[PDB]
């Protein structure tokens with residue numbers, strides 16, 4: 030019931046007690062592990078509020094205080110009267126930071142307590158949402174010196190007045206099916222692009238077209254807005270050794286900003302809560318550029334390198350992969366846009382884990398997501414046993430709104 | 437009940453029904469996943485259902501389920517269990533059981549080969565000397581002058597747990613490791629403890645960087661005995677690089693035969709505590725783990741120096757760059773010497789086809805994503821994008837305690 034995790038490189042053993050506070054389910058059972066699966070009322074609400082408010086008041090060393098009891102008292106009355114309750118600014122900020130702290134798939138959590146929280150609970154229209162998001166984007170970008178941020182829109186009420194950002198990330202590139210049968214742009218975004226066009230977006234039909242925002246306020250029909258082009262910082266990709274690399278015409282955006290997840294705090298649900306940090310290079314260099322279902326550039330780079338592509342065992346794919354990831358890091362660094370390489374980031378996470386075990390009794394981590402998509406075992410996280418479990422406040426997946434929306 | 441897995445690269449969705457046959461625990465609960473944890477004397481009462489489950493599976497596989505031959509065999513085993521408290525497998529059942537333990541091994545990416553396994557029945561073995569002879573024969577057969585053949589040798593099953601056969605070596609072929617008084621390590625740092633045991637048992641250590649360890653062999657619960665595998669039976673490959681002529685001067689080599697000898701084979705409730713098995717190497721096992729783990733030969737720095745990479749900051753990816761070259765060299769070297777080896781692209785591609793075939797014809801394929809995905813270049817192999825279900829089927833290979841921690845010394 031008290032669990033040990035071992036690092037097989039260092040022999041360091043940590044003891045996890047924090048897992049005994051998990052509430053949400055994993056998907057696994059005693060008979061089957063689903064560790065590699067990507068997507069596995071007043072009565073209900075008050076214990077959730079209490080559990081959260083208890084952890085909040087413990088965090089500021091006023092557990093069992095009159096102010097603690099008074100708050101609990103106040104929230105219980107508000108739930109009985111109004112069926113929901115409103116978080117204090119202090120609680121909203123605490124909850125947001127802790128949702129990130131609890132994000133088991135995030136390698137960047139050493140940064141968790143440094144999060145700028147934008148309270149957008151006063152927002153009422155899609156135009157309001159657009160303004161808030163532009164300001165988030167500009168703040169977080171900070172001319173290349175990225176700062177972590179989250180913007181939090183009004184909480185779900187009856188579920189018929191949800192605020193949603195229809196985009197999965199604030200900044201993504203369009204994807205288009207060609208008559209030629211090929212795909213132009215980002216293939217992962219063909220469907221969403223179709224929806225934008227359907228809603229009246231005039232698509233430029235290029236390879237790196239920043240998608241417009243599709244914003245839904247108060248359960249109303251989503252509306253289209255274009256992020257000011259000057260607020261979208263992009264980096265052209267070149268290589269320090271290969272002069273030809275620039276000729277590939279590759280670029281990527283500087284701001285990684287997830288916009289499709291649900292923030293749960295104290296049983297309240299924030300269905301629109303875009304958040305952003307800064308990139309780890311492999312995200313772009315390995316996944317965005319080299320996934321066969323994405324920009325899929327391996328072959329073209331390998332040819333430019335004149336590698337022997339006849340046999341898998343020449344490791345031409347692996348060689349081209351490294352160079353692509355070298356180019357990504359070099360380009361961001363040259364343009365002074367914050368980026369972290371997978372060695373530095375995973376080393377940070379190990380230190381974070383050790384801090385968390387030492388001061389919190391554990392750190393929920395998903396090894397399948399934490400280990401980088403290249404060079405796994407030369408990063409320290411590969412050798413680190415991790416326990417995965419769900420704590421609240423949390424960021425959760427939610428259904429894509431076009432399957433949900435009654436137009 | 438039906439469970440679906442999806443491949444996120446291809447959108448191929450498979451449906452698992454085989455998991456309904458799973459028995460042992462995973463380590464996970466509804467509240468915690470232990471998917472990245474490495475390591476998460478039977479009564480007759482528990483033995484017959486296990487024997488019967490196995491025999492039913494065996495007779496189904498040969499299309500004789502419910503036959504008189506099937507029923508007579510259940511009867512025969514029941515009587516043997518009630519009479520002698522255990523039972524003996526037929527040779528056909530032993531071979532079936534061993535192939536299926538491999539087929540069921542969720543951490544093994546090489547399972548497309550499972551039906552092709554040479555099974556050496558060593559159940560008539562009685563002494564450590566006898567074990568040595570069987571193991572030499574396995575090494576020679578499996579090696580086959582570089583054209584490797586999968587094989588397993590099966591020593592007598594556990595009885596009262598006080599007469600266990602054990603191979604104390606975790607693998608049949610490994611290099612010695614020596615801890616120096618200055619704290620540095622010579623040879624393979626992973627094998628320091630076991631090397632010390634061997635020396636204590638009387639092994640004369642040459643004290644070099646690549647000394648093949650002797651076999652330490654325990655028969656019938658007796659104290660283990662040392663034997664040196666004939667050097668001419670141990671195939672090794674000097675490592676060189678096709679473009680970098682200095683790579684040979686790193687002085688690296690490795691053995692051709694990967695052979696696990698510390699696992700327990702369970703078939704029909706019987707426990708085979710000494711069952712060494714071997715296949716052929718996937719390149720990354722040597723090039724990534726053996727050579728580049730910080731806790732092993734740890735050659736990344738020296739290699740990157742010789743390539744004159746920028747080692748001042750990690751973001752030059754000098755480690756990744758050197759890592760690829762080392763792995764090219766291992767593959768090049770084995771191929772040049774005509775010793776069987778498979779690259780991680782070939783092996784994972786073959787695994788995906790195996791896995792799909794298993795879903796179609798068997799209703800599933802238990803797989804541990806954490807072990808299946810190679811230790812370099814993960815997401816440019818197809819297994820990275822493949823959702824897997826991990827569960828445990830028998831016959832199976834299991835971990836067991838290291839013998840030095842549990843052995844009662846006779847003296």
Ligand code: HEM
Nearest residue numbers: 129132134135136137140177179304305306307308309424
């Ligand atoms: C500041 C530097 C940060 C770094 C280096 C970082 C790194 C990463 C990486 C590499 C991933 C995997 C993404 C993928 O493979 O799709 C990830 C996932 C995630 N991150 Fe972080 N992140 C950072 C900031 C943040 C912030 C500010 C938050 C929340 C406020 C956050 C919450 C999450 C969540 C919930 C996931 C899982 C997303 C999903 O399931 O798709 N991260 N992070």
Ligand code: HEM
Nearest residue numbers: 538541543544545546549586587713714715716717718833
């Ligand atoms: C024939 C070619 C084979 C290939 C290419 C192959 C490949 C692999 C690889 C790469 C691993 C991971 C090794 C590690 O990281 O320590 C592994 C593990 C494993 N293999 Fe296979 N293997 C082969 C044959 C076999 C055979 C013949 C058996 C048994 C009859 C077997 C059973 C297992 C088991 C039980 C594991 C898990 C070992 C552990 O938990 O330490 N494999 N295999």
Ligand SMILES: Cc1cc(N)nc(CCc2cncc(CCCN(C)C)c2)c1
Nearest residue numbers: 198285286287304305306307308309312
């Ligand atoms: C907060 C945060 C930080 C970070 N380093 N990465 C992310 C991921 C952001 C991201 C941006 N564009 C595109 C994607 C694609 C993700 C699709 N995955 C889920 C298959 C993801 C988020």
Ligand SMILES: Cc1cc(N)nc(CCc2cncc(CCCN(C)C)c2)c1
Nearest residue numbers: 607609694695696713714715716717718
């Ligand atoms: C049957 C089989 C096939 C294969 N390709 N690899 C193996 C593993 C072989 C192997 C050989 N020497 C040493 C090791 C060390 C493994 C260390 N792990 C368990 C921590 C492993 C076994």
Ligand SMILES: C[C@H](O)[C@H](O)[C@H]1CNc2nc(N)[nH]c(=O)c2N1
Nearest residue numbers: 065066067397398820821822823
């Ligand atoms: C099937 C498997 O879970 C899937 O491919 C996962 C693996 N690990 C990952 N890890 C990260 N960080 N991001 C991902 O999208 C994935 N994809």
Ligand SMILES: C[C@H](O)[C@H](O)[C@H]1CNc2nc(N)[nH]c(=O)c2N1
Nearest residue numbers: 411412413414472473474806807
């Ligand atoms: C902690 C983690 O489970 C451990 O380092 C695992 C990861 N995956 C692995 N995969 C293989 N094939 N072999 C290994 O030894 C490991 N080690």
Ligand SMILES: [Zn+2]
Nearest residue numbers: 057062464469
């Ligand atoms: Zn699990």
